[PDB]
Amino acid sequence: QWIKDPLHVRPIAHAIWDPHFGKPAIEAFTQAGANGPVNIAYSGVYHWWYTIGMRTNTELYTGSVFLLLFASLF
Amino acid sequence: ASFLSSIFVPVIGWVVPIATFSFLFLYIERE
């Protein structure tokens, strides 16, 4: 989604699963066109990954599984 | 797959601490 409009869409870091949240808080953290409560990413990883040619969640996923195996090798 | 959050967050929150603190407590008090 962020690829299509990088200047207006907010990058999501990860999902929030917190039992302690009330409904107002869940509503408050439901942002950046997410279905549930999420944290906006401020690490600039989206910008970085987009610049270096990644365009799909499948590519990001394949990157993550490779890095597990690369961590495993070390 | 979202249901995994309902499993993992409680495990990392309770099961892992209890298991880790229980073991480390028994290890530091072992004579």
């Binding site: 969640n57 996923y61 993550s64 597990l68 495993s72 | 797959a1 995994l4």
Partner: peptide, 30 residues
């Protein structure tokens, strides 16, 4: 997003560095 299958593969692949991290940690303790 990514499929439920892909998430389950990642978790199973993540057991590999999980196992090797344990083996390294135990070896480093010696």
């Amino acid at each position: 997003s990514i499929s439920d299958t892909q998430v389950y593969i990642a978790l199973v692949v993540a057991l590999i560095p999980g196992l090797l991290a344990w083996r390294l940690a135990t070896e480093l303790y010696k």
